[PDB]
Amino acid sequence: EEAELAYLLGELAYKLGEYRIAIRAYRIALKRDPNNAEAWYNLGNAYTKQGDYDEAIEYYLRALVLDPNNAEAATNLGQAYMNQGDKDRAKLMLLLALKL
């Protein structure tokens, strides 16, 4: 299904550093498959490289809720919170990453 082909395009764009395309591709994929943990995680990663740390948080949260063991998502979410200046949430999620 397109849910995989568009995700592949997103992954290829992200790997090549073309984040502007990666975000849109991941969104086109997610519109059909909202339960896709790695898709949300990569979308948050793309927004993180873009510097939109609060929106990256908004997507990392859904990445974690759908996959509570995702230690890498917790690490990046903590880093995003730190970029937002919330040292407390950032430290909590970093400790969560270490625990997971």
Binding site: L61, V65, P68, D88, L95
Partner: protein
């Protein structure tokens, strides 16, 4: 047909008036009439929890959450049941999901600190307590 909800109402009455043990059966009949009802299961969880039949309340809450995701209240109630069952890891997971659904919920942070402290994650428990205080000192 409306009976599927009439039974829910009957169980709600029998839980409002203090006859929980009949309310559980009323909810059970309602469920057997319509297993997809996200409210019958959720109420049955609390009714069973009050009867201290925790082993069944945990499953009732879990089925309810499966039927209606993202419910920031169901996760917290299931966390309470899990803590009372002593499976503190699953309780910590539940409260973590709760706070990640509603990041502004001070009560979720306080409960997460509670279960983390009892689970031995002292630093995380302290951080969660501070988060709860910052979000709302009255909670």
């Amino acid at each position: 047909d409306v009976s599927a909800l009439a039974y829910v109402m009957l169980g709600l009455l029998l839980s409002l008036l203090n006859r929980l043990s009949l309310a559980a059966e009323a909810y059970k009949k309602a469920i057997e009439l319509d297993p997809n009802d996200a409210l019958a299961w959720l109420l049955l969880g609390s009714v069973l929890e009050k009867l201290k039949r925790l082993d069944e309340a945990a499953e009732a809450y879990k089925k309810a959450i499966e039927l209606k995701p993202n419910d920031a209240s169901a996760w917290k109630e299931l966390g309470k049941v899990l803590e009372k069952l002593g499976r503190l890891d699953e309780a910590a997971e539940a409260y973590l999901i709760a706070i990640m659904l509603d990041p502004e919920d001070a009560e979720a942070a306080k409960e997460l600190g509670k279960v983390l402290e009892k689970l031995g994650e002292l630093e995380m428990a302290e951080e969660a307590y501070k988060l709860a205080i910052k979000l709302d000192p009255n909670d």
